[PDB]
Symmetry: D2
Subunit: 116 residues, 4 copies
Amino acid sequence: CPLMVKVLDAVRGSPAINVAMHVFRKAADDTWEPFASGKTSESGELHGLTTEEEFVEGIYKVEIDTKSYWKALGISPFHEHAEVVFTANDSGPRRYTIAALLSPYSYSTTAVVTNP
Amino acid sequence: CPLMVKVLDAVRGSPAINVAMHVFRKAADDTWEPFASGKTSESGELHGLTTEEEFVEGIYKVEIDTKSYWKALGISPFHEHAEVVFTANDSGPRRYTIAALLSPYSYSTTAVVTNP
Amino acid sequence: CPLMVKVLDAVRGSPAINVAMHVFRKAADDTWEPFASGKTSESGELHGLTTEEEFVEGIYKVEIDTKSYWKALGISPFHEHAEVVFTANDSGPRRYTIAALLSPYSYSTTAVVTNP
Amino acid sequence: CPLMVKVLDAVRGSPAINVAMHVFRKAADDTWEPFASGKTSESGELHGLTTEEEFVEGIYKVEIDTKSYWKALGISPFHEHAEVVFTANDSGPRRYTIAALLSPYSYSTTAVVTNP
Ligand SMILES: Nc1c([N+](=O)[O-])ccc(Oc2ccccc2)c1Cl
Ligand SMILES: Nc1c([N+](=O)[O-])ccc(Oc2ccccc2)c1Cl
Ligand code: NA
Ligand code: NA
């Protein structure tokens, strides 16, 4: 599991389920190329985004559709989405967990990076 | 103003107004003695808790009554309070801003420490 | 697993390993009775603190020794410890995950509460 | 002052000083157009980015150059930048404070939205 995303809900004290996100990789012309995507499970986790061989050096952007999540709960949010932009695999493969904790007007994000 | 506390509401995107808090200082017998108390203003800030002369070296605890805050908004929150425990003025007088960002099931707290 | 604590390190991007903590339960005289304790594993997690039958209604305090964690890394921290105080099991058993994300001058904490 | 950004350093317990950031606004063709830029002061705050007349309805992005900040302190951070994307002034003019709390592998961001 080279890249996993975990999302939590700070209002309900629960995993954030069915949160959609796309992953992009920065292209040579500075545009964002589609790379992976999915929705969080009932555990708030999204596994299986990529494989070790496909996940090479680059700048990656995880764009998490937090706005649709809050609107489904009938809550008006601040952000259009939560974006996480980072260089990955510059020193060869690593395993990355991107975590996000969501509130309607705030989010926090952290990374856990491990050498396989 | 050597000690200031600022509290923000991550659900509503606003200062957390009229939040009560109590400050304690550890006594020689290791019990918590009352030190100061107050409530946040319309800006979410509590100023004037202490003075340079009174705010001596010690271990201090700020106990923020987050539970009453959420209950008054019709939210049943997770925590009884948000607690911040720290040694102050160990290397001479400093000015401390304690900030807290509140959600029903989560809080974040940070400190800004400056040398006058 | 009625009560689990997970701790992450925001400076190193890693689980916070070997973080010691004690759990207390508030007694009828408002004192804090010892309840459980342990240290986080290499995954940053502490499992096995209690059992469903022992973990009944009460106000619980998880006192996480963040200061010793940072001092072992040669980093001077702000807080004496990170405290998480919450009522548990007031509506019968639940499963609780307490998570904390640590920085030298800040911490964030959230809860995931699930009905078994 | 309809838009202000405040940045704090969770490692040092200080304002994050001399942090560069760029603000963009989504154009009719869905591209990001430059809107304003600046750097935080000794208080960690960036004031004067825009005016009430210029700060019309739209989708805005604040891109905070956290990577250069950490690198100058000798830290190799995780994120390329901290990004905040939001719709502004949808229901008439508001005043926005965007706050960010920075660690090498994590950031938290919140908004305070007030009606003048
Ligand atoms: N994370 C955080 C916390 N915190 O205690 O973690 C407190 C406040 C906060 O926003 C502000 C608000 C005012 C000044 C600086 C930062 C954030 Cl963004
Ligand atoms: N904010 C935060 C907190 N927290 O106690 O606030 C704890 C953990 C965390 O990342 C994770 C990491 C793994 C699983 C769930 C969340 C974040 Cl992002
Ligand atoms: Na001293
Ligand atoms: Na409108």
